[PDB]
Amino acid sequence: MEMIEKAPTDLEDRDKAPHLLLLAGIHGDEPGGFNATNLFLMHYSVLKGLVEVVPVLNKPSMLRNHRGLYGDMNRKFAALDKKDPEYPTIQEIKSLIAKPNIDAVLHLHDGGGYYRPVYVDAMLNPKRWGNCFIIDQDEVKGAKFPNLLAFANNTIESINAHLLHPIEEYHLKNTRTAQGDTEMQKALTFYAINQKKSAFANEASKELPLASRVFYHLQAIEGLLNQLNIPFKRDFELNPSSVHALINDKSLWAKISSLPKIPLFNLRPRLNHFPLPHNTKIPQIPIESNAYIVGLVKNKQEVFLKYGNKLMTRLSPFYIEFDPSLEEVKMQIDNKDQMVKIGSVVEVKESFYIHAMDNIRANVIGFSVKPNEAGYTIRFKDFQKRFSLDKQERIYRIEFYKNNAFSGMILVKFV
Ligand SMILES: N[C@H](CCC[C@H](N)C(=O)O)C(=O)O
Ligand SMILES: [Zn+2]
Ligand SMILES: [Zn+2]
Ligand SMILES: [Zn+2]
Ligand SMILES: [Zn+2]
Questions:
Q1: 95 CA distance to ligand 2 centroid (A)?
Q2: Domains in the chain: how many in total?
Q3: Which residues fall within 8 angstroms of residue 274, CB to CB, at 6 or more apart?
């Protein structure tokens, strides 16, 4: 996991309001939480103070849509064997929580049903955790903001001013953890209370569609930020339609290794003969995105590209040495010569032509005449469209080889 800071543009403004640590994704099958932290990171600005964000605590489990591959990570904050696979991660998390710079902690979850204080039915009862705002105790002496109960009551009131359906009404849950809630005594927020941080958990119901879960998580975040007097902005209107559009953001991309950025959405469901660097374990292959919850994971003979719990495409890998010597290629684009950098996307209105290179072979994927296809003037009508990266059939791979090594890729997009 990674921690990402959301700070004011002026460094000196960091100490002028409180500091929140915002965490989600300790359970890998709770996408409301880690899509909310993602959207917070992408679309909000913190104007004074600081919000530190760990958008997904348990990324290996998120990648396999799993509650916890190594067990429940949210029961590992008390006793823990040093040989537990997550022991180092727990120590990193405790370190972040217990830093003197942190004042408050907000931990996001998705939970089944809808909590009610007395039993109604199977979906609505006190054993359920959905749509409630949780504290371990009413007060934490020594904290900058000791009145957890007041903060919670006000945060709940804020959320409840924006209910989508009345059944979704938020309720307070005080677990009184120090008084023998054996389970909660091993969880993250109790650890935070014991470091004299004001700590809260927000749980959105799993009965809700993802965009509604994320809506309630953002409402909780905004409610707590208002209580803390951490000033913020966001670049969208907070409603489920907007949230849906921002999760399904067609501007999202992924850059795998030194390859060109590819769009996250509307990829073909399988990409064949996809070059990946050899002798590299999948978790160590670099992958960048403008989102914060994107990754690669092995599944049988494929490598999945994941956006949270969403499967964006199935890579059928071609493991090969990535020779980094080739920096750029001379291409004619729409009659005009230019030096195109390896790893870029070039837009094409009409045509292109790759100038031949002594020791480099070009394969235009979807075009045919160990193919060498430099020296051909290529138009959209020359492509077999099923080789496109995208469902829209506009984006094609050009792969370069200095045999038997991969020298890089350029994408052409027909516009
Ligand atoms: N349903 C959650 C409750 C966690 C509440 C609080 N102790 C926290 O850590 O977030 C769980 O069983 O993990
Ligand atoms: Zn935005
Ligand atoms: Zn959870
Ligand atoms: Zn409001
Ligand atoms: Zn040149």
A1: 30
A2: 3
A3: 303, 315, 316, 317, 318
